[PDB]
Amino acid sequence: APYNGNPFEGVQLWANNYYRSEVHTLAIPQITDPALRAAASAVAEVPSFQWLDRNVTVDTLLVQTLSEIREANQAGANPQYAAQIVVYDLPDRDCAAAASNGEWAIANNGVNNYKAYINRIREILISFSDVRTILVIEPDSLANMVTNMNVPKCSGAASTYRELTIYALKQLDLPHVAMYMDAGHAGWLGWPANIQPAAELFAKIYEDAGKPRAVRGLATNVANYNAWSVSSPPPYTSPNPNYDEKHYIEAFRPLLEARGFPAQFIVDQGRSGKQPTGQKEWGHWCNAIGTGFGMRPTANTGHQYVDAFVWVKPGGECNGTSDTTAARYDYHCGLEDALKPAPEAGQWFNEYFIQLLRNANPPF
Ligand SMILES: CO[C@@H]1O[C@H](CO)[C@@H](O[C@@H]2O[C@H](CO)[C@@H](S[C@@H]3O[C@H](CO)[C@@H](O[C@@H]4O[C@H](CO)[C@@H](O)[C@H](O)[C@H]4O)[C@H](O)[C@H]3O)[C@H](O)[C@H]2O)[C@H](O)[C@H]1O
Ligand SMILES: *[C@@H]1O[C@H](CO)[C@@H](O)[C@H](O)[C@H]1NC(C)=O
Numbered sequence: 001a002p003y004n005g006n007p008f009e010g011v012q013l014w015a016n017n018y019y020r021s022e023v024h025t026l027a028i029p030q031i032t033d034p035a036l037r038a039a040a041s042a043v044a045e046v047p048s049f050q051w052l053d054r055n056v057t058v059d060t061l062l063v064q065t066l067s068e069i070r071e072a073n074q075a076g077a078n079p080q081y082a083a084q085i086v087v088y089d090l091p092d093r094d095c096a097a098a099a100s101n102g103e104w105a106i107a108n109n110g111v112n113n114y115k116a117y118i119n120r121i122r123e124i125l126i127s128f129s130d131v132r133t134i135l136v137i138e139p140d141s142l143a144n145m146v147t148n149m150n151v152p153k154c155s156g157a158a159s160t161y162r163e164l165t166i167y168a169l170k171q172l173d174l175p176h177v178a179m180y181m182d183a184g185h186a187g188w189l190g191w192p193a194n195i196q197p198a199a200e201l202f203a204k205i206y207e208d209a210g211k212p213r214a215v216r217g218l219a220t221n222v223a224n225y226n227a228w229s230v231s232s233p234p235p236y237t238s239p240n241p242n243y244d245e246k247h248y249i250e251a252f253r254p255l256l257e258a259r260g261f262p263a264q265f266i267v268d269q270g271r272s273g274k275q276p277t278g279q280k281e282w283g284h285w286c287n288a289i290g291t292g293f294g295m296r297p298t299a300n301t302g303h304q305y306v307d308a309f310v311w312v313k314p315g316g317e318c319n320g321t322s323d324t325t326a327a328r329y330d331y332h333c334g335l336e337d338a339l340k341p342a343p344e345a346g347q348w349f350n351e352y353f354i355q356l357l358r359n360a361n362p363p364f
Pocket of ligand 2: 059
């Protein structure tokens with residue numbers, strides 16, 4: 001079915017069984033404290049995005065979640081539940097990263113692999129047209145074209161990132177779908193020197209895709225820890241005037257809008273509850289200490305440019321291993337402000353989950 005306006009309005013957000021199963025089968029059994037177990041049980045019901053970060057998730061997790069939502073909706077959910085999904089499998093993924101877990105390479109049929117990926121997701125979404133579906137498109141992709149074109153892998157991947165983003169925006173432009181392209185965070189693209197070129201890039205992509213109706217705007221702070229709005233700039237933000245997501249979005253949207261893209265925003269707050277964080281530098285993204293679960297997902301943001309506060313990166317799922325000998329070890333995960341020992345990216349990290357619980361704001 002079609003919708004008008006903010007896709008988060010008039011629906012409830014589904015909390016998926018993948019995350020719920022991590023909490024119940026992996027987290028809770030390691031927790032003996034009654035209060036923390038009850039808090040954990042509660043966090044399992046908070047509706048976070050489900051990531052299609054590996055091809056195998058398409059015909060498993062995506063189908064499962066949409067099937068489960070349809071079942072719940074047909075069983076009388078009111079209002080109806082909506083899905084929240086991340087598309088995250090570009091070839092030569094994370095081009096500026098020290099290490100990537102992306103499975104596909106441009107040199108190894110990655111373009112065709114990705115197009116097939118998008119085409120299968122399209123088929124599944126059509127099959128589940130009765131479940132409104134909100135997508136985040138490719139974290140850590142086009143933000144690299146703004147600042148990291150000096151990196152050979154990024155320069156070599158740029159035309160592919162662009163073409164394939166346009167491909168996804170057109171192929172997933174379906175009436176029951178909404179899309180938000182990733183747009184980094186205040187401490188990446190919000191810096192004054194970066195913000196106009198970022199607006200130029202995103203608005204051009206939007207134009208080049210034919211301004212598809214399903215595209216609502218942009219997603220910010222995905223997998224990061226920034227504040228939505230705080231009175232004093234965290235120390236590691238200096239000297240950025242855009243020291244929180246509200247400042248970034250208020251500066252960014254007029255630039256985008258003048259360029260033909262009046263983007264609405266969704267802002268990750270899943271690990272933003274504690275401010276300031278334990279990050280020693282803004283760019284320390286990996287398993288940062290001193291962070292907490294943040295404000296609960298809601299369409300009622302109170303801000304004219306923000307369609308929803310969301311939990312995109314699910315807290316407790318590791319950002320990367322701290323084992324320096326591991327094949328895909330990223331040195332950011334070995335820093336003094338990265339919690340250790342940490343398992344491989346995407347694996348449950350229980351000590352990190354407990355940290356997020358203890359620092360939760362609002363508390364569980
Ligand atoms: C006054 O001029 C400005 O000075 C400041 C301070 O020196 C400059 O700040 C620096 O901006 C850089 C970007 O231009 C970033 S690097 C940026 O960091 C982010 C994380 O915050 C990286 O994205 C993450 O990438 C990970 C993989 O490596 C992903 O796993 C993760 O999901 C992403 O968030 C990004 O790739 C990097 O390019 C510096 O941290 C910051 O100090 C500013 O540039 C000057 O204009
Ligand atoms: C991706 O998964 C699909 C099934 O959803 C499969 O048909 C395809 O072969 C997989 N892609 C690659 C490159 O292995």
